[PDB]
Symmetry: D3
Subunit: 284 residues, 6 copies
């Protein structure tokens, strides 16, 4: 597994800090003194999966010289309970307090996603079927969100419109055929791109499998349909189910001979995971 | 209320577009076509519309793109699934390449407005306002605050530079409520609102006496809040916060507080489903 | 007091350096050798108040590895005489000479402001009345300029149109009333924003004080008027005097029961404070 | 002369606008209004107009905004208090939110042009040009140089890459005037002007002999300059600099120097008062 | 094919313009002129036109500038010296200040398209495609890929995020061809093409067996390639690469490979001469 | 001589790295392990002149903590043969492999230019005549390209339209005279700018030399013409020959009393110089 790198994230965290301070942090600067070391504790207030700890840390490190301490040796991925002491943060009060909210907003958002993902995986209860994310991401945080999904046991779809070809309802509409669209796609980007078709009917699934595409997406199809689609396609393409996949629904795929399912809810509708920073103490 | 301006949003939408297309949109560019086209924007789910200008603007930065609004939909309107919110007219390459970004904005924003409007309704008391927080999605605060407004909510301080909020940690570090307020007033004398976050009736007393502008009752029982109201006796504005959800929120109904605030509105909003379907060529 | 942070200033100094070098510094690079340590001295050529020393230093530090020496222990705020040895700068010749002008232009501009501010404070001669800056700032240096004002013994008005509400002549014009404008302002940003009204007549001052606004600004009012305005308002709002406040005028407020006065001249019309960098020596 | 172009100024005006509005303009947005409006730009003080295009452009980046110039004012014109320089037409939100930034540019630039024109007048000699310096406001050099031109001044080297200026420190480090010039010519052979800053008649002699393009007489007495002129005998162009102010400047009047230069024009310019008043609605 | 969009290119052209003008264009601004003007864009050399939109766009970001295309030239057309490709209409300051940047784009891009088209011709086999690489000019990859398309070429993976290419070093570090492929598939399961770079027939065998999408034959003899084709037996797509030049390229003519690739097309392209002459004033 | 500075180049290399990685380097990250030190060797596969070694190095250093080793002590400027071991690069595998192509693309491009330049200088075989570059540069790499030219023994023309005045065919067209254009140029930028005129005929050369311009450029003139132009001008201006100067042509200037020649081909049409990175080994 791969953590996130400062090279990847620095510009985004900078922007977020600027979002949160346009002149200065009056509330904190009024009370504190420029000098003097302090310690604050990061506590998990809710159960789930840890994600974004590096990102959390990095918020502080761009701002100021700040040290950490990890007594329980927590890592992105670890399961969490409320009251767990995830991390200790050491530095000047001004740094600890000004940076707090941004850091937490990243941590809370990411951990939320990883937790929702891990819970989907569990509710599915079938290793042979993978859980994938989408491009239904929060604007300008896709990178961070894809990472969280991985941390929760999920997997990454195409990142971008540049990564791979996905012929959607609208693409097929504009050509007028499933097969003409695939042909055109193959003509345009001959060998280096995966080609996927999004499909609503069994008609369209047949056309696609026949034209020899790499991946077929079954959009919002009934279980009866999917069962038939599987047999139709008969291993000619990989199979993805998508649309309207949630914690309750997801178990319906258990045991099917599809390759993966994908969910937008993991990225566009994730509940965040509560943490807090309490127990400010001076070193002394 | 007041819409979002290109000046405010353009850099963010540009960035989101670049996020989504590093080289080119292979899928779409592959379509060898005859011409103007039209696609329809449909609401797939009930709630409140927010971010329609933003949605539109994604297309308008990319290319020359026209709209049509047959049902005269505006940010704020209630929506039902299948409503024809908008029609988008332009080249296929523009319509398709811009689609996902535009929708991701629209879905996220409408989601927030919907959740907000629902909190307002569950509260059922116009004399008490619903406020957002700083518990926002990183780099989208501006947008999120706007959505809250659209849903009938109100805006807290935008950030740490807007206004002074003396939290648990601040009061800890000084050792007094009143010394902290004095120090805050000394630092930013007349142009900044000062708010104090408070857990006990002790602390609420100190603060109201020291003449602060806003007192925040953190996670207090209803018995307590009732007494706090009386103690404070109109000396400061009153905010209740902490652990405010769709079910809880009605507990405030009778009260002579000024507002309540919720993070859940910004950090945990379910997005609102829309789609773009029905691609047709014009001729 | 709070100094300025690299986080706050780095992007601006970078931009200024780029302004001053688009390819390279031909004049300096032609003569120097890439290698070899040197020392230059920063001298105050004019009396006043020091401001922007950190900023001065930081110009060099972004560019190159550069050390300083402060034999007289000078700090932003200290009073200065011509010939004072403010600082010694140690590093490669190329760094010392290429960075010089930018660094000085910051220092000179900031110290100029702090000096003009301190002189206003002195000419006023009344601690009970504070001296405030405005939004009449040099474009893209507001942050730096507000800081200098603080250093000279002044105080900071609202930074931005986002910081606080100020209902000006034009706002009141567009509504048609003083009180309707205040009402509208309170309706729009209910509790978290200070509300100020800018006022020319005693009529308007009465309306505002009655509607219970936080701050009233007396724009360019005669001393007779201000005296009456004070009594009218009768402590209902804070009182700010503004417009046409200069070194000579400013003493006219001495002893009045107003809260502060504010001046644009401090930021839009500050004379800069002369320094120079002389006595280049090689370490050897 | 030649105006400033959007290409040149847009990024700076965008930044200044962002400086002034981080979230939104609460004050102005609070106005719930009927419609196009009109505001008038009045000169509050006498001097020279500079930066009118810049002023205008602040509004035009923000929003669709029209102007009207009934007295046909142009950068360069002389101004009196109460002159109606311009009329601005657009939505209230645009007129009010953009106002201060626009004025801060206009005031600063006009201030510089005015001070410049006044130096030119106090000099009273067309054969001697007034030049600006690198002692500029950080990140506004471009703008400041333009204002100087508008006021009848002329532009020195824009920066350390434009042209070679061998200062006291440079000559110190080589140990000779002539060796420094030789080294400069060796480094940038044909495409760069070479100037030498000079304190004695000794050094002026060396430089003129070595055939440099421009000699700068730093802070020299009038007796000296008179002799320097003779010594140099047209071999190089001649610049006087150091300690040149509105009172001093007339001392150069008769002289056969090419130009004088002043920092005060850019680092110490008093700004020129304008205001925007008389908001009216159109109908 | 599909043109380049302002969305794609604007930031790069802005930067190039800023590269070329830090303060102002002294040369051009010095011209004190009467008015619209017209300049003609002439091809000085034979080859393939590419980047005409880009050329145009340089002017259109700067200023209001119109074009005229009397011979209806389009990216892709063959060119001869003296052809009147385009006419440019606008203010002199715009025409002259923008000229060099615009031409530098046009010349570079057309150069690449020309070299590409020439490789395609020397190959003389439609069943085998000519591909570009990642051996591109820094920060112009997008543009360079486009030019290749215009010249009749095709696009490899745009970068290290587009698709998986297991090179000599990768296979070295795992120690197996097949283990490396397995690991790649495990890491990015369904959405990424996997290619293997291969030097021996051993390695080609392993790869084809493990079912990879594309095999690259690095710098292999014609005898070898012939056998490799047979060995692989349609299981993977086949790419030949390494040491492919205008003279060599014809050696592939009969073969049942899918494509060949060349770096020289992007890292070593001779540019294609154009000029802008015949400045006239309109009246 | 002056190397290139991080201050100068960092933004460009960052942009190039981002160009080459929008999400992550899947190929490398799949195989490697985050941990573990390795060494790769940089070999010259082709003879010529080294340029851009610092730039090469810097690509890696922005990305990650990476060390170098230079056993043969190679410097920008050194002559090279195929198989020479230019440099050794030491760091994590992920860094070595992800950064490789960008680094090489800079090195190859720059060394290519320096080699083509040095070869022009040699083919000219006349020290009294200098070889100059132009503004016919690769967009957004001018700075890097000018440097390479210097490294190959060449010299730098004006960087920018801001550096110096060059009155071209189109400028002279728009005024209608050679001399009116020069006069206008002198009026606009009086003393601080060199003035050059680009000239096709002997007529125009005479006008210019008479009006006392600093530099005259003979555009694409026959050797007979140039010979006459030299005598005409009679030392009144410096002389530049330009247009259609290539490796074969260039010797035609040998012994002429011109000051320099200039070539666009050096920057717009340089063949790149082959290097490669081979011999990946783990430290162990």
């Amino acid at each position: 597994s791969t953590d996130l790198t400062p090279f990847q994230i620095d510009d985004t965290l900078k922007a977020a800090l600027r979002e949160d301070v346009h002149s200065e942090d009056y509330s904190t600067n009024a009370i504190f003194d420029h000098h003097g070391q302090a310690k604050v504790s990061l506590f998990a207030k809710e159960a789930g999966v840890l994600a974004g700890l590096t990102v959390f840390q990095r918020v502080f490190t761009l701002f100021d010289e700040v040290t950490f301490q990890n007594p329980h040796q927590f890592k992105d991925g670890d399961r969490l309970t409320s009251g767990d002491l995830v991390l200790e943060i050491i530095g000047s009060v001004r740094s600890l307090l000004t940076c707090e909210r941004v850091a937490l907003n990243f941590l809370q958002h990411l951990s939320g996603i990883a937790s929702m993902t891990a819970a989907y995986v569990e509710a599915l209860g079938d290793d042979r079927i993978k859980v994938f994310d989408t491009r239904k991401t929060t604007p300008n945080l896709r990178l961070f969100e894809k990472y969280a999904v991985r941390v929760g046991g999920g997997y990454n779809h195409r990142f971008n419109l540049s990564d791979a070809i996905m012929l959607k309802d609208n693409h097929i509409a504009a050509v007028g055929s499933v097969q003409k669209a695939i042909a055109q796609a193959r003509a345009y980007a001959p060998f280096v791109k995966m080609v996927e078709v999004e499909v609503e009917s069994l008609a369209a699934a047949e056309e696609a499998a026949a034209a020899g595409v790499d991946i077929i997406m079954l959009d919002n199809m009934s279980l009866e349909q999917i069962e038939q689609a599987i047999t139709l396609i008969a291993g000619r393409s990989r199979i993805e189910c998508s649309g309207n996949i949630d914690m309750t629904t997801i178990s319906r795929f258990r045991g099917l001979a599809i390759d993966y399912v994908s969910s937008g809810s993991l990225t566009h509708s994730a509940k965040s995971l509560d943490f807090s920073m309490k127990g400010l103490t001076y070193l002394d």
